[PDB]
Design an enzyme around this catalytic site. Structure first.
Site, PDB file in Angstrom:
ATOM      1  N   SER A 165       0.743  -1.072   0.072  1.00 44.31           N
ATOM      2  CA  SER A 165       0.030  -0.079   0.060  1.00 44.31           C
ATOM      3  C   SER A 165       0.773   1.229  -0.060  1.00 44.31           C
ATOM      4  O   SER A 165       0.359   2.428  -0.104  1.00 44.31           O
ATOM      5  CB  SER A 165      -1.054   0.052   1.274  1.00 44.31           C
ATOM      6  OG  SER A 165      -1.794  -1.072   1.030  1.00 44.31           O
TER       7      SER A 165
HETATM    8  C1  LIG Z   1      -4.715  -1.786   6.127  1.00 43.06           C
HETATM    9  C2  LIG Z   1      -3.955  -2.796   5.185  1.00 43.06           C
HETATM   10  C3  LIG Z   1      -3.733  -3.984   6.172  1.00 43.06           C
HETATM   11  S1  LIG Z   1      -4.902  -3.458   3.807  1.00 43.06           S
HETATM   12  C4  LIG Z   1      -3.688  -2.460   2.762  1.00 43.06           C
HETATM   13  C5  LIG Z   1      -3.121  -3.076   1.657  1.00 43.06           C
HETATM   14  C6  LIG Z   1      -1.707  -2.263   1.508  1.00 43.06           C
HETATM   15  O1  LIG Z   1      -0.427  -2.685   2.150  1.00 43.06           O
HETATM   16  N1  LIG Z   1      -2.689  -4.473   2.097  1.00 43.06           N
HETATM   17  C7  LIG Z   1      -3.513  -5.745   1.795  1.00 43.06           C
HETATM   18  O2  LIG Z   1      -4.368  -5.476   1.117  1.00 43.06           O
HETATM   19  C8  LIG Z   1      -2.970  -6.880   2.428  1.00 43.06           C
HETATM   20  C9  LIG Z   1      -3.682  -7.258   3.686  1.00 43.06           C
HETATM   21  C10 LIG Z   1      -5.052  -7.235   3.529  1.00 43.06           C
HETATM   22  C11 LIG Z   1      -5.584  -7.636   4.645  1.00 43.06           C
HETATM   23  C12 LIG Z   1      -5.005  -7.771   5.762  1.00 43.06           C
HETATM   24  C13 LIG Z   1      -3.683  -7.528   5.965  1.00 43.06           C
HETATM   25  C14 LIG Z   1      -2.887  -7.191   4.905  1.00 43.06           C
HETATM   26  N2  LIG Z   1      -2.965  -1.709   3.532  1.00 43.06           N
HETATM   27  C15 LIG Z   1      -2.634  -2.427   5.008  1.00 43.06           C
HETATM   28  C16 LIG Z   1      -1.948  -1.212   5.688  1.00 43.06           C
HETATM   29  O3  LIG Z   1      -1.926  -0.200   5.775  1.00 43.06           O
HETATM   30  O4  LIG Z   1      -1.186  -1.768   6.590  1.00 43.06           O
END
Ligand SMILES: CC1(C)S[C@H]([C@@H](C=O)NC(=O)Cc2ccccc2)N[C@H]1C(=O)O
Length: 255
Positions: A61
């Protein structure tokens, strides 16, 4: 051609000088981690775990920072046009289950908002941007979500370089686009400092295996850019990376 080309693409090669931060090791108990700081005024890098600071890892992200800037630059987003309507698809995180703007989508890390952006950008345009800004291995072959545990990878030091380049207006993005994007990731704003940053988490083998927190602290006379990366079998996520970063930053008396 040689496999070694690909191995060398997995690491950022620089021989920049840096102050060693080995006393930060206790903060990374349970992880292969790295912390990179760059002091803008003194033009100086400080690093915990230099080998790990140069290993390229999926940005997850944290990539949303540049995806947003790309979208502004292509006029997909504009200063009064950042709203996307929710498609009524139920996600496991309720904050995702609603209309978003740039601020909320960055704050809640709303994947679908950024997937939509990438959907409307020409793949060859994105490649051009990644070449311009020197985004890690620049590899977007992987999936469609090339930034999520896929082909695209970047190191902690590069994460820091990119934020610095953005802020020092070395990138070709509009200053007002940058200001919008910085606002979306502004965590705290006081008289004596602005604290900006973005988390990332990657899942591998059903576990939280890749954690990021990257950003900077802008003071009245300096800017301190930072990236923290965590590699572990489980519990390596953005929240833990941020926690560690904030302990280190407070300890350095920056926040
Ligand atoms: C809020 C999140 C956990 S989701 C989003 C994205 C981006 O990394 N990551 C993922 O899509 C992988 C993920 C999904 C669900 C739980 C943990 C990681 N961003 C994460 C963050 O800010 O740490």
């Amino acid at each position: 051609g040689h496999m070694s080309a690909h191995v060398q693409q997995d690491k950022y090669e620089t021989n920049v000088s840096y102050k060693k931060l080995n006393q930060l090791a206790p903060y990374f108990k349970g992880f292969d981690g790295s912390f990179v700081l760059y002091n803008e005024r003194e033009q100086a890098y400080s690093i915990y775990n230099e080998p790990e600071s140069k290993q390229r890892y999926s940005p997850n992200s944290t990539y949303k920072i540049y995806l947003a800037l790309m979208a502004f630059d292509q006029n997909l987003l504009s200063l009064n046009h950042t709203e996307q309507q929710w498609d009524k698809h139920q996600y496991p995180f309720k904050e995702w289950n609603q209309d978003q703007n740039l601020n909320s989508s960055m704050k809640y890390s709303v994947n679908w908002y950024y997937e939509n952006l990438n959907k409307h950008l020409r793949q060859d345009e994105v490649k051009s941007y990644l070449d311009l800004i020197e985004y890690g291995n620049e590899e977007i072959s992987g999936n469609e979500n090339y930034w999520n545990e896929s082909s695209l990878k970047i190191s902690a030091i590069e994460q820091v370089n990119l934020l610095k380049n953005m802020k020092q207006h070395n990138m070709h993005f509009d200053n007002k686009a940058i200001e919008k994007v910085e606002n979306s990731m502004t965590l705290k704003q006081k008289d004596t400092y602005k604290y900006v940053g973005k988390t990332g988490t990657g899942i591998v083998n059903h576990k939280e295996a890749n954690g990021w927190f990257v950003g900077y602290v802008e003071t009245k006379d300096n800017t301190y850019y930072f990236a923290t990366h965590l590699k572990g079998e489980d519990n390596a996520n953005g929240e833990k990376a941020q926690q560690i970063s904030e302990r280190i930053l407070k300890e350095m008396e920056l926040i």
